Amino acid sequence: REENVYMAKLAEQAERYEEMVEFMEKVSNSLEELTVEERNLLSVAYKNVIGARRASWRIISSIEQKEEHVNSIREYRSKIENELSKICDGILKLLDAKLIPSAASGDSKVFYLKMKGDYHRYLAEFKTGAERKEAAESTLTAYKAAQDIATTELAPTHPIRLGLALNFSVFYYEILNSPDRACNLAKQAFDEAIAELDYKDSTLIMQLLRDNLTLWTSD
Amino acid sequence: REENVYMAKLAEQAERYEEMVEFMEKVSNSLEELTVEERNLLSVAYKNVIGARRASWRIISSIEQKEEHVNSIREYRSKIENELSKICDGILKLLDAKLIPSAASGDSKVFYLKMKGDYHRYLAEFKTGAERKEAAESTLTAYKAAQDIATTELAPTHPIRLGLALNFSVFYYEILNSPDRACNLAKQAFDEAIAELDYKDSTLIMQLLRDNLTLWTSD
Amino acid sequence: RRELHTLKGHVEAVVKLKGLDIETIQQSYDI
Amino acid sequence: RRELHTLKGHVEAVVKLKGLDIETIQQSYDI
Ligand SMILES: O=C(C1=C(O)C(=O)N(c2ccc(O)c(C(=O)O)c2)[C@H]1c1ccc([N+](=O)[O-])cc1)c1ccccc1
Ligand SMILES: O=C(C1=C(O)C(=O)N(c2ccc(O)c(C(=O)O)c2)[C@H]1c1ccc([N+](=O)[O-])cc1)c1ccccc1
């Protein structure tokens, strides 16, 4: 165990994330109640692996749109997307299998639940048919299932409480394509964060929320 | 052809370089006198693919050193290095096979020759035995073979003329571990660049040269 | 921080450097 | 530009962000 953790921090440092995911996979299966550290390593691993694709993805899609040739591009995006479904598919089972099932506290549960919604969400970013839908749904049910715990077991300023809010609110506006319900979740989350402002991780999230509004309020 | 070029620019944009190398490989073999553009795409492709490794490499090695555990690290670096030899090995044959053999002008020749020295040099960065040596040698013979053409067929301000100088001068100081001969090549190259300063690509190289000295002159 | 810890920031960085003159691809800020 | 177009610049960027407190790994500027 101590090795994969370590071997993981290497892949991190080295910035060889895909390999960072593996060392972590090992860690999870090689297991009890996964530790904050490991938890936050498995994420960052998947965060980056996945992240790299969405980025490659968007630009691509962005270039594809411009053209309208397009044939080839789509081909590429095809290849790319394929990768997405993978990482997503990967992290998800690991969620259902080992992670969630063990959760013994708010953060943990709120944390994972949150993850489970995010990748389901990422799946919603490019899927088009039955999948696309079952995702949006799965997204919603996931975040909501989390929100019930956070808004109740976590302080309105707690990073997670905030982290969830932010993404959830990007799920609505961007996935379900319904600006209204989003903003409220945004603003609501933001306000009740203030009403108790009396750090660093939270503060940086509250900032992203305001940016989302002012941005969603300007189209 | 037009496709792989294009398909290449995608991988570029997308920032999926390894794939950018392939599209290019296709391009080379699918061939005449490779065009400036394609030439400079094949490079950037290899530049980045390779580049990513050296970086992962250094940090790693850097972390390995600190420790003195180290066992595992080395294992990783092992894996990493393995990759290096590959890209290098790849670009090199392509050099001997298609590229060089056709060169019909200073830049081209000076250009490639330059490439051939660089990767040979990159091979010198981590190899240890007979290989390491044959590399340093191959490095030298490569750059020198180039220098004979540049310093003669190119203007002292010409990027390549400069590009070569810079690296060549990092070969000495860093590979052969002989500061003296380096600086002169550095300074010499820098001066004769000025003596005619009367843009953008060159100017940015002359700056790197000065940085190397002041840096090599301070240890 | 924003271009360090968000897909949006990163995307905006790359697209700018890449001289990519394609027109703004809308996106929000997601952790 | 230097952290954009040189292994040295890049390495120095990452190492800093990664809070990597290992001590300077010497390196020159190579195109
Ligand atoms: O709030 C807690 C955090 C961590 O543990 C942790 O490592 N955090 C962290 C640090 C540096 C980062 O760069 C990132 C990042 O990836 O943004 C995240 C905090 C955090 C919060 C919300 C999310 N989130 O919803 O995406 C992600 C991370 C917490 C507190 C108690 C128990 C568990 C978690
Ligand atoms: O000088 C010529 C250049 C190009 O063609 C070209 O594309 N350049 C270029 C542009 C943007 C970049 O970011 C980079 C980079 O990778 O630094 C490089 C110039 C260049 C110079 C020296 C080297 N080099 O020695 O590594 C590499 C590139 C030239 C002039 C005539 C014919 C052929 C080449």
Q: So what's the overall shape of chain A? A: globular
Under CATH, the topology of chain A can be stated as Delta-Endotoxin, domain 1
**Pair with the most extensive interface?**
A-C, 24 and 19 residues
**Overall number of strands of chain C:** 0
Query: Counting H and I runs of at least 4 residues, what is the number of helices of chain C?
Result: 1
Q: Which structural class is indicated by helix and strand composition of chain C? A: mainly alpha
Largest sheet of chain A: none
Let me know the largest β-sheet of chain C: none
Helix/strand class of chain A: mainly alpha
Oligomer: heterotetramer
Radius of gyration of chain A: 18 Å
- Annotated CATH homologous superfamily of chain A: 14-3-3 domain
PDB class: protein binding
Keywords: all helical, protein-protein complex, protein binding
Assembly: tetrameric
Entry title: Structure of the 14-3-3/PMA2 complex stabilized by Pyrrolidone1
Please, could you describe this protein's structure?
The complex is a heterotetramer, with two copies of chain A (219 residues) and two copies of chain C (31 residues). With 219 residues, chain A is mainly α. Chain A has one domain (1-219): 14-3-3 domain (Delta-Endotoxin, domain 1), CATH 1.20.190. In chain A, 84% of the residues lie in helices and 0% in strands. Chain A has helices at residues 2-14, 17-29, 36-67, 70-102, 106-124, 130-153, 159-176, 179-194, 201-216. Chain C has one domain. Chain C is flat, with a radius of gyration of 9 Å. Classes of the chains: A mainly alpha (219), C mainly alpha (31). Chains in contact: A-B, A-C, A-D, B-C, B-D. The B-C interface holds B 12-13, 15 and C 14, 18, 20. Bound molecules: the ligand O=C(C1=C(O)C(=O)N(c2ccc(O)c(C(=O)O)c2)[C@H]1c1ccc([N+](=O)[O-])cc1)c1ccccc1 (2 copies). One copy of the ligand O=C(C1=C(O)C(=O)N(c2ccc(O)c(C(=O)O)c2)[C@H]1c1ccc([N+](=O)[O-])cc1)c1ccccc1 is lined by residues 36, 40, 44, 107, 111, 114, 159-160, 163, 201 of chain B. One copy of the ligand O=C(C1=C(O)C(=O)N(c2ccc(O)c(C(=O)O)c2)[C@H]1c1ccc([N+](=O)[O-])cc1)c1ccccc1 binds at residues 36, 40, 44, 107, 111, 114, 159-160, 163, 201 of chain B.
